[PDB]
Amino acid sequence: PKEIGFYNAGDNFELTPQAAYRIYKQNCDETFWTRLHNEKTIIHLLPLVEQDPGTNMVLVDDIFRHHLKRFGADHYIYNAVMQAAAFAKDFPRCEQLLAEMRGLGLEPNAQSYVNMMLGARLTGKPRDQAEAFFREGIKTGAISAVMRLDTEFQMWMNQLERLGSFKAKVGYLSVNEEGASPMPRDMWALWGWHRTEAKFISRKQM
Amino acid sequence: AAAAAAAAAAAAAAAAAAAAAAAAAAAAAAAAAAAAAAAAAAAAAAAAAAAAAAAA
Amino acid sequence: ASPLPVAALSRLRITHRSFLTRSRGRHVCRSAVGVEYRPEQQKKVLDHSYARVINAEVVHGDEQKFWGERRTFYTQRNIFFPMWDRCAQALILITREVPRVPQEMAFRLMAVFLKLMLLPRLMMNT
Amino acid sequence: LSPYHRDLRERELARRYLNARGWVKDMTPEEMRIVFMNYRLPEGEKRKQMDEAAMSGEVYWT
Amino acid sequence: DEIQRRVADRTCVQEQSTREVQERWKRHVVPRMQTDLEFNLSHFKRQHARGQ
Amino acid sequence: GAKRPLAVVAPRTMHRYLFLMHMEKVTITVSPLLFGYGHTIQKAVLDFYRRAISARSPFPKDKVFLFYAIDHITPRI
Amino acid sequence: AAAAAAAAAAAAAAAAAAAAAAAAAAAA
Amino acid sequence: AAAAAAAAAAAAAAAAAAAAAAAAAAA
Amino acid sequence: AAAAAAAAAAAAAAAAAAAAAAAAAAAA
Numbered sequence: 001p002k003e004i005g006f007y008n009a010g011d012n013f014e015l016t017p018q019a020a021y022r023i024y025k026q027n028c029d030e031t032f033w034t035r036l037h038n039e040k041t042i043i044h045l046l047p048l049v050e051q052d053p054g055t056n057m058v059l060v061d062d063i064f065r066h067h068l069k070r071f072g073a074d075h076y077i078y079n080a081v082m083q084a085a086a087f088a089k090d091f092p093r094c095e096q097l098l099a100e101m102r103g104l105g106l107e108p109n110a111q112s113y114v115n116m117m118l119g120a121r122l123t124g125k126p127r128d129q130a131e132a133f134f135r136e137g138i139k140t141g142a143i144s145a146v147m148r149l150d151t152e153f154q155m156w157m158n159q160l161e162r163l164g165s166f167k168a169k170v171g172y173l174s175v176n177e178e179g180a181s182p183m184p185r186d187m188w189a190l191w192g193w194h195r196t197e198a199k200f201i202s203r204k205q206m
Numbered sequence: 207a208a209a210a211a212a213a214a215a216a217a218a219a220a221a222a223a224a225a226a227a228a229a230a231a232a233a234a235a236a237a238a239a240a241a242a243a244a245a246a247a248a249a250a251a252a253a254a255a256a257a258a259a260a261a262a
Numbered sequence: 263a264s265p266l267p268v269a270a271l272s273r274l275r276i277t278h279r280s281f282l283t284r285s286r287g288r289h290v291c292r293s294a295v296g297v298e299y300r301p302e303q304q305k306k307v308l309d310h311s312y313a314r315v316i317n318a319e320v321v322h323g324d325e326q327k328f329w330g331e332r333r334t335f336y337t338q339r340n341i342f343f344p345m346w347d348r349c350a351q352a353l354i355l356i357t358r359e360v361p362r363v364p365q366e367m368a369f370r371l372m373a374v375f376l377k378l379m380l381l382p383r384l385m386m387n388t
Numbered sequence: 389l390s391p392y393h394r395d396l397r398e399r400e401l402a403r404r405y406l407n408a409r410g411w412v413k414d415m416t417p418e419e420m421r422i423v424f425m426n427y428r429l430p431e432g433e434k435r436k437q438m439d440e441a442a443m444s445g446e447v448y449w450t
Numbered sequence: 451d452e453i454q455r456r457v458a459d460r461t462c463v464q465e466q467s468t469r470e471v472q473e474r475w476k477r478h479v480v481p482r483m484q485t486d487l488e489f490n491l492s493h494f495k496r497q498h499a500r501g502q
Numbered sequence: 503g504a505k506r507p508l509a510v511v512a513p514r515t516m517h518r519y520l521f522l523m524h525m526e527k528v529t530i531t532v533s534p535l536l537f538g539y540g541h542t543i544q545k546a547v548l549d550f551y552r553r554a555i556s557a558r559s560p561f562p563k564d565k566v567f568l569f570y571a572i573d574h575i576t577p578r579i
Numbered sequence: 580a581a582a583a584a585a586a587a588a589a590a591a592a593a594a595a596a597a598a599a600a601a602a603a604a605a606a607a
Numbered sequence: 608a609a610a611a612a613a614a615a616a617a618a619a620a621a622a623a624a625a626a627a628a629a630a631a632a633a634a
Numbered sequence: 635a636a637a638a639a640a641a642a643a644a645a646a647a648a649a650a651a652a653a654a655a656a657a658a659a660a661a662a
Contacts, residue, residue, distance in 0.1 A: 229486060252584075
């Protein structure tokens with residue numbers, strides 16, 4: 001049913017948020033539940049994070065605490081929740097979280113610096129606060145950038161301006177229309193060249 | 207939560223970190239036992255340790 | 263809650279680098295997680311200037327023979343020695359017993375006399 | 389029966405786990421140690437391994 | 451579960467052995483193990499330096 | 503240090519052997535404390551070493567360095 | 580007190596100094 | 608005289624330290 | 635520990651010296 005998920009305009013099966021959170025709350029402690037499933041769940045919650053940060057950051061924190069007590073710490077989880085905090089426009093939360101990374105012995109990932117840049121951007125804060133994140137990240141040996149710093153920072157920001165948020169007036173994420181289908185309207189659809197390379201394959205194949 | 211690519215743990219897969227006794231957790235523990243126990247038992251321990259030293 | 267021991271933070275690091283890799287045309291996102299020396303200690307390693315990390319050949323001479331040992335005992339199959347016994351002999355030879363000198367034992371025997379002789383000295387200092 | 393692998397607790401349930409499925413069942417464990425041994429291994433060290441005494445001595449010290 | 455079970459039937463029989471070797475290590479070696487390993491390595495390094 | 507910009511297209515073959523190309527040192531750091539049975543990354547890295555020092559390897563065998571580390575290192579090359 | 584003595588006899592000079600320092604810092 | 612020595616051998620490091628501190632404070 | 639210190643605090647200098655001599659003779 002539509003609540004649970006559906007095959008959207010690209011014939012892709014996207015799982016509904018608030019559907020995904022319930023799947024989490026059933027599967028929190030399951031044996032098969034791996035640490036990637038947690039960060040995937042958190043990734044599913046992001047539009048809810050933007051459009052109401054007050055009541056959805058509590059969910060993110062539930063997943064956060066539960067993860068941190070099921071596994072001592074992980075890189076995935078910190079990337080995920082600093083991304084969430086980036087979309088929720090809590091910036092000092094991002095610095096706080098990063099300090100928690102470094103204090104924890106965790107080496108902040110390339111993605112963590114991209115999340116720093118995102119949070120630095122859409123929280124309405126000036127360039128040279130993002131620039132600093134990029135330069136520090138590249139000194140750290142996280143980002144490997146082949147071009148000079150200026151033009152490549154231009155590249156990153158030009159990608160993020162295309163990617164403007166779920167609440168914004170211009171961006172990819174700001175586009176809300178979804179072809180709603182229970183079933184993909186072409187079942188022999190192709191990700192490849194040949195029919196061997198078809199998009200939809202059996203579950204015991206997957 | 208339908209898609210996951212490849213899981214990775216903090217340690218290597220199928221490889222156990224073998225135990226080793228560190229500096230403080232041994233030394234300071236020995237000092238704590240020697241402190242809280244007695245000076246008589248400490249004297250006996252000093253006697254056995256000196257016996258091991260003369261043996262060494 | 264720190265994954266590394268409190269002692270190891272000032273030395274060690276957890277490096278997570280996640281890469282898209284192609285397999286049979288698809289793309290799987292695979293990550294390398296590892297525990298690793300910090301770059302100061304790393305260029306201490308590459309300089310051959312670092313303790314707490316020992317060169318292999320000083321443990322047992324000429325690893326070109328040791329890891330390249332092909333089994334010769336009553337057999338024409340020249341398969342290498344397994345992994346587990348090589349790792350085993352390695353970590354055994356690492357962990358052997360050093361001949362602790364009686365000099366250090368004497369320093370420690372002097373150190374055992376700290377409290378009693380200090381109280382005896384403090385009682386006579388008035 | 390070497391110090392490390394001589395454990396009756398992990399041995400007896402191993403034997404009965406084998407004997408659940410109809411694996412060799414007419415066995416005293418000490419004749420298991422005779423029937424199963426390296427056969428191209430020579431006589432001396434194989435009686436050494438059969439003997440609890442001679443192998444009782446090999447122990448990791450420290 | 452069928453995923454992790456098939457991956458397990460591929461690679462997992464070995465950690466069964468690894469755990470028992472590990473607990474052997476923490477029972478028979480560790481309590482009599484050396485406390486300062488850096489002094490050990492320093493010793494080996496200086497002895498190899500001396501040609502000994 | 504780059505005076506002229508970098509390339510855009512890469513050559514593709516299969517490298518069967520390590521040969522010393524533009525490298526001056528190869529450091530293989532393994533902590534033996536970390537222990538595992540059966541196929542593991544430890545086995546892979548040390549097989550990298552085994553191939554590096556084997557008879558048919560074009561790599562000069564004086565510059566392959568192996569290090570035993572004390573505290574729990576995910577073996578790196 | 581036997582195992583304590585066995586472990587204490589194996590300590591290095593830096594280790595013995597650290598032990599004496601921790602003992603004298605903890606008490607007196 | 609022997610009783611005080613015997614009682615001193617039954618003291619902890621904290622006990623002998625506190626006794627030393629008290630002896631330094633008093634005399 | 636407190637009783638021993640209280641007993642030692644009431645002793646004279648000669649008594650303390652004698653106690654020190656006894657401790658040097660017995661325990662050393």
